[PDB]
Every structure is written in structure tokens, then in C-alpha cells.
Amino acid sequence: MIELTSAPTTKIEIISAAISMVGKQQTVNTIDGGGALAIDAEKLYDTLVSAELGSNRWRFAQAFQQISIITTLNPTFDGWLYECQIPADCIMVQYLYPNIQYIVFGDKILTKSNQTFTLIYSRNVPVSKWPPPFSLYIVYHLASMLGISVTNSDRMLARISQGMEMWESRALFADAQSSVTLPFRHNPYVDVR
Amino acid sequence: NPFENYGLAGFLTPGQQYNADIYDLTLPIAHKRLADKMLMNMVPQGQQWVKFTPGDEFGEPG
Known about the structure:
Structural class of chain A: alpha+beta
Helix content of chain A: 25-40%
Keywords (chain A): Plasmid
PDB class: viral protein
Largest sheet of chain B: none
Strand order of the largest sheet of chain A: 2-3-6-5
Structural class of chain B: mainly alpha
Order of helices and strands of chain A: HHEEEEEEEHHH
Keywords: LME-1, legionella pneumophila, phage, podovirus, podophage, viral protein
Largest sheet of chain A: 4 strands, antiparallel
Oligomer: part of a larger assembly
Radius of gyration of chain B: 22 Å
Subcellular location (chain B): Virion
Distance between the termini of chain B: 52 Å
Entry title: Cryo-EM structure of the portal-tail complex of LME-1 phage
Order of helices and strands of chain B: H
Shape of chain A: elongated
Shape of chain B: elongated
Strand content of chain B: under 5%
């Protein structure tokens, strides 16, 4: 039988950890009555988590899906022929498969071909899918925003900052090191041959 | 390379590209020049590089 993790597995446990970091007792079952700290944590959690997963290639947050050409839409510049719909859960476009010509333009992907394309992208994932280093990084970062929004304490902000930066680097390393580094897709001095 | 395409070489698809990933030509140049050098020193064309001689049945020379 599998040993269950003791790391946070729900967004409420992430929030209550950040609230305890700035000094307030908090249980998961009384989060509704948490006052100003709970109000700000709930409001800022979604914006922070989406911003973090939407601005860096985290392996645990990656996904793929086929994209669809939208009818009656025709670009008239640079030889682009089709506008394609981005997936609904897509939070940051990373690249397309296969290696063809494309650009992200507006909220669409422009292509010159009508074959099947697959998009690799970031998405929101629940806390139970997070690596433990990432969870602690979010706790520090969320507690940093609670320090600004609620405590109004410069002293608290100074104390949280070093831990927030350290766990960001360690979370990035833990995520990155598990897999090999992929080569460049374009290598002109070799491809020309 | 006669072993390309599992020995079929150019029988099935002629005109293939084979040398695109040979960035260094040191070995191909030296290999060709050595083979050419062996040809000129073993069978120099336009010269009489071998002679027929009477065999042992004809006795001692002279």
C-alpha cells in the first residue's frame, strides 16, 4: 500500500500555511471566518498561481492538445493563411508540433498549412499534482503578498523575501533536473547542408 | 558506400544524398590519395610493370 503524502494537497492547505507563516492560527475547516487574512489570501491565490504557471515552463504543468482552424478568418499579411483556436485551458503557449511556420498573433495561432498541429502549453493543475518544493515556494510567495496587503509591516516583508527567493530556485531545479535538455530546433549552419 | 540502404545502394532510389553529415574531409581525402598512390606505384599505367620470363624447364639463363 502507498504511503500518503503529508505535503499540502488542496488549495486550502496552501492558503492556511501562508496565513500561519505571517503568524495567525488557521484550520482548514474555519477558513470562512478567517478575517482579512483569509479574504486577501483567497482573492490573491488564483492570480498568483496562474501568473506563476503562466510565465515559466514547469514540467508538472505541461499539456498538449490538437488545435483547430477557425472558418471565415483569413489573415492578409506575411503569407499567413489560417487562424487557429488556442485550447481553453491554455495558460502559456510554448511550441507547436511538428516544426513548421507559426506565430502567436492576438489570441490565435497563425499557420500556413491545414495539417494537424498539436500545441504544447502550460495549464493550471490542482495542488495534489504539485511538487513539494513548488508548494513551499507558493506558500512563501503568497505570504509575501499577505505581508503587503494586510500586515503593512516592512519588517515582515524583509524576513520573508530571502526564503521566497531561495525556494523559487530550488523548486525550479527540482523540476528541471529530472529530464535531459532538449536540443535547439533551428541549427542553420547544419540545416543548410 | 556500397553498404548503404542494406546493400541496395542506388538500385532502388538513385540520387540520394549521403555525405551531408561528413563535416570533416580529412579521412576521405587521405583515403583517396593513398589508393591513387598505390595504383601508380604498383601498376604504373603506360609502363611495363611486369615481364614474362622463361620458366625453370628451359634451364639456366644465358
